[PDB]
Design an enzyme around this catalytic site. Structure first.
Site, PDB file in Angstrom:
ATOM      1  N   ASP A 124     -15.477 -20.027 113.847  1.00 22.63           N
ATOM      2  CA  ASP A 124     -16.824 -19.883 113.302  1.00 22.63           C
ATOM      3  C   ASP A 124     -17.828 -19.447 114.367  1.00 22.63           C
ATOM      4  OD1 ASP A 124     -19.232 -20.090 111.984  1.00 22.63           O
ATOM      5  OD2 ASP A 124     -18.894 -22.097 111.196  1.00 22.63           O
ATOM      6  N   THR A 125     -18.072 -18.143 114.465  1.00 24.70           N
ATOM      7  CA  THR A 125     -19.006 -17.617 115.459  1.00 24.70           C
ATOM      8  C   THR A 125     -20.444 -18.043 115.181  1.00 24.70           C
ATOM      9  OG1 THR A 125     -19.261 -15.526 114.238  1.00 24.70           O
ATOM     10  CG2 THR A 125     -17.558 -15.618 115.932  1.00 24.70           C
ATOM     11  N   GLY A 126     -20.702 -18.531 113.970  1.00 24.29           N
ATOM     12  CA  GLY A 126     -22.030 -18.976 113.592  1.00 24.29           C
ATOM     13  C   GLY A 126     -22.320 -20.420 113.957  1.00 24.29           C
TER      14      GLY A 126
END
EC number: 3.4.23.16
Length: 198
Positions: A124-126
């Protein structure tokens, strides 16, 4: 461009004639923007996340320019704390996750081993931080609150936890709490040399 994950992967977008900054978010199925003016008809919709659910307006067939690239798709607008570009639009601009290469037509899940147990988690880059669903971990922790799409949740912060993600080992802080899905955040993504490429 290639993007490392030591900082939030933000990009400039143009949508509805307006300029905005948004987070490239491999952990998001859908693109969700803070309240803004868009042309036309919409449908009420509820979406979920850490903290619970929010009501959003769904607009279809909206033109979006993300970095240098155009895409057309559905955009949700509502009380999200941050503008997020989800996989629905990441796939259109040819974004991949590299660490193995991974396209984003499906959720980027990996198998992890932590606290002697096996789990599946979302790359999850967010997410600034790694957050796991309730589980038994060794040792001491500290009460903590973290925010997200639907509000805040209380989590237990465990420090110096060994995690093996796909092949690779890493050590760092892990939060444990009522997250709907196990999330590997940038704190650990950086340790396995993950990058975003488009």
């Amino acid at each position: 461009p290639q993007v490392t994950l030591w900082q939030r992967p933000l990009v400039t977008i143009k949508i509805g004639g307006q300029l905005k900054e948004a987070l490239l978010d491999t952990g998001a199925d859908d693109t969700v923007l803070e309240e803004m003016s868009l042309p036309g008809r919409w449908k009420p919709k509820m979406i979920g996340g850490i903290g619970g659910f929010i009501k959003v307006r769904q607009y279809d067939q909206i033109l979006i320019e993300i970095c240098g690239h155009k895409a057309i798709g559905t955009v949700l607008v509502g009380p999200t704390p941050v503008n997020i570009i989800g996989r629905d639009l990441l796939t259109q601009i040819g974004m991949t996750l590299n660490f193995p290469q991974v396209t984003l037509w499906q959720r980027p899940l990996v198998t992890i081993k932590i606290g002697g147990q096996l789990k599946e988690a979302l790359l999850d880059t967010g997410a600034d931080d790694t957050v796991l669903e309730e589980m038994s971990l060794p040792g001491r922790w500290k009460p903590k609150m973290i925010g997200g799409i639907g509000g805040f949740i209380k989590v237990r912060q465990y420090d110096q936890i060994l995690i093996e993600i796909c092949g690779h080992k890493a050590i760092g802080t892990v939060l444990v709490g009522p997250t709907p899905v196990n999330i590997i955040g940038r704190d650990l993504l950086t340790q396995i040399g993950m990058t975003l490429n488009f």
